[PDB]
Amino acid sequence: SAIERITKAAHLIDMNDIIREGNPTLRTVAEEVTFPLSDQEIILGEKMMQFLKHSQDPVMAEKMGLRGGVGLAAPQLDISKRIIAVLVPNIAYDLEAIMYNPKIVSHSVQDAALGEGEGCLSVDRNVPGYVVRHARVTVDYFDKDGEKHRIKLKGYNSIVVQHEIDHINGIMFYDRINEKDPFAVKDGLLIL
Ligand SMILES: O=CN(O)C[C@@H](CC1CCCC1)C(=O)N1CCC[C@H]1C(=O)NC(=O)c1ccccc1
Numbered sequence: 001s002a003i004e005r006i007t008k009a010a011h012l013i014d015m016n017d018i019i020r021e022g023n024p025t026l027r028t029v030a031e032e033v034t035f036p037l038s039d040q041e042i043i044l045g046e047k048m049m050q051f052l053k054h055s056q057d058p059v060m061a062e063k064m065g066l067r068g069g070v071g072l073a074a075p076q077l078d079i080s081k082r083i084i085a086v087l088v089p090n091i092a093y094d095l096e097a098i099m100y101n102p103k104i105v106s107h108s109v110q111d112a113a114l115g116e117g118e119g120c121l122s123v124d125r126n127v128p129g130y131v132v133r134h135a136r137v138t139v140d141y142f143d144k145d146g147e148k149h150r151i152k153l154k155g156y157n158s159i160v161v162q163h164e165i166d167h168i169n170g171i172m173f174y175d176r177i178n179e180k181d182p183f184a185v186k187d188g189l190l191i192l
Pocket residue numbers: 055056067068069070071072073076089117118119120121122159160161163164167
């Protein structure tokens with residue numbers, strides 16, 4: 001089982017654990033975790049966070065062959081549970097969270113998109129275009145202890161968490177590009 005294998009003490013997550021488009025797990029809606037969490041579910045969240053930190057560490061990223069990443073969702077490991085990790089570096093970190101059962105509870109009418117577009121660790125190609133998301137979101141999630149957090153995101157951090165939540169709902173970033181005019185800007189779309 002992917003979770004039993006990845007949560008072994010001796011295993012460091014690397015690109016070989018990340019599934020790519022064509023695997024149906026990326027199109028499946030992931031299952032809610034229950035509380036209390038099992039050790040495996042806690043360890044999985046920790047291992048995903050270690051992957052992100054290793055991926056942003058140039059020494060470790062080089063030794064492990066990693067693509068640097070700011071977010072990861074358990075379905076990208078072939079594990080269909082609603083668990084995500086986000087790590088956004090400050091320009092230590094502007095946002096660092098392991099989220100269980102994350103949910104958007106409120107969002108702005110305004111939309112937003114990264115002006116550079118998006119890629120994905122599960123996507124081995126480039127898909128240009130504005131990926132249209134909500135500009136601001138309020139997100140509820142639980143931590144490893146079962147305590148509820150409610151956070152407000154905007155800017156780049158809002159886009160990142162939205163990308164990962166799309167993963168646990170079976171959605172890919174290019175689902176949000178308008179293929180007819182990928183660079184179209186409707187009224188109410190803020191290009192970041
Ligand atoms: O599900 C999650 N992923 O697919 C990983 C995405 C998540 C984001 C996609 C856009 C908003 C969320 C992800 O980090 N990138 C995808 C391709 C490259 C890498 C990326 O942009 N790296 C960096 O910014 C980066 C690279 C190195 C160091 C620091 C930052």
